[PDB]
Structures are given as C-alpha cells and as structure tokens.
C-alpha cells in the first residue's frame, strides 16, 4: 500500500482497472540469499493472473506466464539481459499497451508479453511476493 519502502507481500489496487497506456514502476533489490519472487497483475484479490513475472535466481531465468481459468499456459523465457542478479538493484517500468505488456528494466527493453487475458481492463490488482526488497512502487 505505501509507495516508498513497501513491504512484501505488496497488494495494491489499480483504480479504474488496468487502463491502456497505464505505467507501473517497481524499483527493488534482489537479495543475495533469495531464490525467487513474483510480480502478478491480477483480476480481483485471488482470481486470474493476466501476467505473472517470476525471476528465478537459481537458474537465472525470467519466466512470464498467465494463470487463466485455473491453469498455467506456456512459459515465455527469452531475454537479452537478466537484471535480477543476486544483490542487484533494478528499475522496472511496466506499460499496459492495447495488445501487449511492454516491460523495461533499467531503461532497457526486457520483454513484450502479448495479452492472453484480452480484456486487460479487468486487471485491478498488483501483487508482489517472494524474495525481493522494494524501494519504490508507483501505481
Ligand atoms: O509457469 C509459471 C509457474 O511455474 C510453476 O513451475 C512450473 C515450472 O516452471 C515448469 O518448468 C514446469 O513444467 O511446471 C511447473 C509447475 O507448473 C511455478 O510453480 C508457479 O509458481 C509459476 O511460477
């Protein structure tokens, strides 16, 4: 709920839903002893996950997926850089476009994720969980 130094798990509501052109900023720190953390764009408290972003420190992967109508779909993992190294600070910018989420990290394009939940407007919950320290979250 706060903007600065919010504790994990973070739960924040997107007023008027996830509007087209809406940008979410997440500034954080990856703990050296952490294993994984997740950023979830969700429909209402404990419903569908339109976009699940899950950096995993053991294998250095950045897994993207959707949890829709009870099931995970296919993972998207391709990147040209991993900014979530142990003990690193990162600055994420997440923009909801008409056909895809566009995600930048430290100013550099990280991934696009095409919408699988088509009506992206339905997303009203930003969730952040796991092994991550947050300095700033702007919704
Ligand atoms: O796909 C996101 C989802 O992954 C789950 O783990 C997967 C694992 O990544 C995959 O290699 C295997 O085929 O299936 C596992 C179970 O679905 C995580 O458990 C879950 O939290 C999400 O991160």
Ligand 1 atom 19: the closest Cα is on which residue?
72
What are the structural domain ranges in the chain? 1-139
**Which residues make up each annotated binding site for a beta-D-galactoside?**
72-78
Q: Is the CB of 72 under 6 A from ligand 1?
A: yes
Q: Evaluate whether 128 touches 10 at the Cβ level (below 8 Å).
A: yes
Residue 11 alpha carbon to ligand 1 centre in Å: 22
Cα gap 52→101, rounded to integer Å? 11
Which runs of E-coded beta strand occur in the chain? 10-13, 23-29, 37-42, 49-56, 61-68, 71-72, 89-96, 100-105, 108-114, 125-130, 133-138
The residue behind tokens 């949890």 is 67
Coil/strand/helix, residue 10: strand
Q: Is the CB of 75 under 6 A from ligand 1?
A: yes
Contact residues for 35 (Cβ-Cβ < 8 A; gap 6+): 56, 57, 58, 130, 131
**Fold of the 1-139 domain:** Jelly Rolls (2.60.120)
Q: Which atom of ligand 1 is nearest to the CA of 38?
A: 23
Q: Is the CB of 54 under 6 A from ligand 1?
A: yes
Per-residue burial over 102-137, b if 16 or more Cβ lie within 10 Å, else e, is bbbbeeeebbebebbbeebbebbbbbbebbbbbeeb
């Amino acid at each position: 709920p706060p903007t600065f130094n919010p504790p994990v798990p973070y739960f924040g509501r997107l007023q008027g839903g996830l509007t087209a052109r809406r940008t979410i900023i997440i500034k954080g720190y990856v703990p050296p002893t952490g294993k994984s953390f997740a950023i979830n764009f969700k429909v209402g408290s404990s419903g569908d996950i339109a976009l699940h972003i899950n950096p995993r420190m053991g294998n250095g992967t950045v897994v993207r997926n959707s949890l829709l109508n009870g099931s995970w779909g296919s993972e998207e993992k391709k990147i040209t850089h991993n900014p979530f190294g142990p003990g690193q600070f990162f600055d994420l910018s997440i923009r909801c476009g008409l056909d895809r989420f566009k995600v930048y990290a430290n100013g550099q394009h990280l991934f696009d994720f095409a919408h699988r939940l088509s009506a992206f407007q339905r997303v009203d919950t930003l969730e952040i969980q796991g092994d991550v320290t947050l300095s700033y979250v702007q919704i």
